[PDB]
């Protein structure tokens, strides 16, 4: 076991509609975006995103 | 002394209450959950990883026969092949052109690097919650860890706290979990000894250095078709590799109630769920009699602009008159409005501005200063910001979620209908009994 440098992505811009958000994402190579809800149901998502 | 209050299980959200003893000055106390841990009971079934197939140096009998033996090695296979004539670089290796049986063996071990890349299969049982609490009563703050069951006296220096039972039973773990390199999965794995080729748990041991390994990897030993010495075999894929390709998403991304999942030991931390009953026994050196606390003579509440928001979106000022100085507390006596401060300095005459958080369109709560109650009346507009980075500090109640204007309209319409029906019924009865009276 050791430590390796890993990249940090471009921080997205959030737009904040009513009872929701949209994330504007920039990605040259595939990076992973996951979400979940903090109540009884998580409604979890996961997707590798390339592009803007 | 004793104070029985229910606290929502939400980390970082303070809970304020006022203990009003029948002979002492009111005392502020604030109960906040700093951290919670939900650790279950676990029992290891086995370890699994990628297996290593070992083909030994084959045995050759030149003008005789061989027989398959029995072994304890995992997935041990053996086959005898006659009519053999094997070659090496030097040439032929036997002196009979036929009847030259060969013995083929195969079994499996743990790969050299399984000491890092491996999974542990565990069964989980009743999960028990422990919380860390910060309790500030008057001038003293206290930190303690307690078990939320209802019996265990939570650690309390110069205090006593009993938490539990939790209002709901929740666990993010199914009956069977697997852990691989710090990631936790809810996976239904085969029992120890119930191995299937090509699936997770196809090689099983208690430990990685364990000498007894059970496996079932579907090894087939084939008759050699070439002249050089060779042990041909075919096998199923590694179930551990297949699972690593089909593991899914971990439990750190799917756990409800915002639980954070950690290993060593397996636990869920900082979950927000249910309500925690707490009983606290306050020491009697923390109470001061009313003969020592200031006694204000009047107080009025004026509400500034307010919004029903997750933050302290409201404000109010108290105008008072006390007979002397002191350090009285403050408190809001509604479940839908919470103050930001808890104590204040009061003087002969003055004002104090206080900030609050509400979920109600209307701010009609009751505020105390030195224990004296005043009524605040205003209406709060909907917030402009749609999204914030804070949790809501109060809960939403159907009664204090409808505006007074809407209540007035609804009551006017329903009462108008009821009054129309009552007028109709009274007219029916009256103009019918007129028949009785007239004749």
């Amino acid at each position: 076991p050791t430590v390796c440098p890993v990249p940090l992505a471009h921080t997205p811009t959030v737009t904040k509609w009513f009872k929701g958000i949209t994330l504007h994402l920039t990605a040259m190579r595939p990076t992973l975006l996951t979400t979940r809800k903090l109540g009884l149901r998580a409604d979890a998502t996961a997707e590798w995103i390339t592009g803007s | 002394f004793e104070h029985a209050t229910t606290v929502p299980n939400v980390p970082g959200i303070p809970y304020k209450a006022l203990v009003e003893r029948a002979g002492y000055a009111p005392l502020n106390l604030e109960i906040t959950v700093v951290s919670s841990e939900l650790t279950p009971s676990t029992n290891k079934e086995y370890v699994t990883c990628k297996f290593h197939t070992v083909i030994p140096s084959p045995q050759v009998k030149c003008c005789g026969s061989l027989e398959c033996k029995a072994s304890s090695k995992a997935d041990y296979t053996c086959r005898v092949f006659g009519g053999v004539y094997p070659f090496m670089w030097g040439g032929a290796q036997c002196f009979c052109d036929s009847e030259n049986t060969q013995l083929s063996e195969a079994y499996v071990e743990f790969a050299p690097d399984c000491t890092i890349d491996h999974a542990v299969a565990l069964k989980v049982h009743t999960a028990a919650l422990k919380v860390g609490l910060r309790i500030v009563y008057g001038n003293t703050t206290a930190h303690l860890d307690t078990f939320v069951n209802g019996v265990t006296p939570g650690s309390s220096r110069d205090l006593k706290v009993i938490a539990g039972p939790i209002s709901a039973a929740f666990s993010p773990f199914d009956h069977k979990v697997v852990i691989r390199k710090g990631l936790v999965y809810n996976y239904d794995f085969p029992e120890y000894g119930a191995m299937k080729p090509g699936a997770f748990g196809d090689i099983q041991a208690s430990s990685l250095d364990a000498t007894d390994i059970v496996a079932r990897t579907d090894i087939r030993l084939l008759k050699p078709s070439v002249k050089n010495i060779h042990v041909p075999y075919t096998q199923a894929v590694s179930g551990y590799e297949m699972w690593k390709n089909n593991s899914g998403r971990p439990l750190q991304e799917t756990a409800p109630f915002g639980c954070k999942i950690e290993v060593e030991p397996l636990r869920a931390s900082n979950c927000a769920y249910g309500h925690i009953p707490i009983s606290i026994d306050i020491p009697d050196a923390a109470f001061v009699r009313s003969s020592e606390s200031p006694t204000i003579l009047e107080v009025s509440c004026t509400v500034a602009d307010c919004i029903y928001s997750a933050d302290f979106g409201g404000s109010l000022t108290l105008q008072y008159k006390a007979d002397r100085e002191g350090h009285c507390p403050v408190h809001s006596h509604s479940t839908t409005a919470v103050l930001k401060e808890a104590t204040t300095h009061v003087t002969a005459v003055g004002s104090i501005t206080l900030h609050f958080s509400t979920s109600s369109p209307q701010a009609n709560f009751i505020v105390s200063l030195c224990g004296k109650k005043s009524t605040c009346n205003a209406e709060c507009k909907p917030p402009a910001d749609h999204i914030i980075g804070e949790p809501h500090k109060v809960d939403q109640e159907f009664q204090a979620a409808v505006s007074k204007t809407s209540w007035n309209w609804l009551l006017a319409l329903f009462g108008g209908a009821s009054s129309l029906i009552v007028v109709g019924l009274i007219v029916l009865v009256c103009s019918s009994m007129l028949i009785n009276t007239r004749r």
Side-chain angles (χ1 to χ4, degrees), chain A residues 16-17 32 36 38-40 42 44, chain B residues 249 253 255-257 259 386-387:
Chain A
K16 295 184 185 184
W17 31 285
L32 185 56
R36 64 175 179 162
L38 307 176
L40 177 69
Chain B
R249 301 314 307 172
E253 309 172 357
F257 298 113
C259 295
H386 294 109
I387 307 295

Side-chain angles (χ1 to χ4, degrees), chain B residues 139-156:
Chain B
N139 184 214
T140 57
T141 63
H143 300 270
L144 58 93
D145 301 319
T146 178
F147 279 95
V148 182
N149 45 31
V151 190
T152 312
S155 54
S156 252

Side-chain angles (χ1 to χ4, degrees), chain B residues 51-54 74-75 106-110 203 213 215 217 219 235:
Chain B
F51 55 80
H52 169 245
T53 306
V54 22
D75 211 15
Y107 55 98
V108 295
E109 290 176 349
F110 286 136
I203 169 161
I213 310 181
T217 60
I219 310 184
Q235 202 182 5

Side-chain angles (χ1 to χ4, degrees), chain B residues 2-47:
Chain B
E2 271 226 317
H3 180 221
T5 178
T6 306
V7 176
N9 180 23
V10 181
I13 299 274
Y15 182 84
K16 278 134 143 50
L18 197 74
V19 291
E20 288 159 327
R21 169 133 65 155
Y24 289 81
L27 184 73
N28 54 277
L29 85 159
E30 181 193 2
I31 313 172
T32 175
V33 186
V34 186
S35 41
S36 50
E37 281 173 358
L38 185 62
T39 85
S41 285
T42 57
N43 187 269
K44 183 195 290 183
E45 290 286 318
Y46 49 86
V47 283

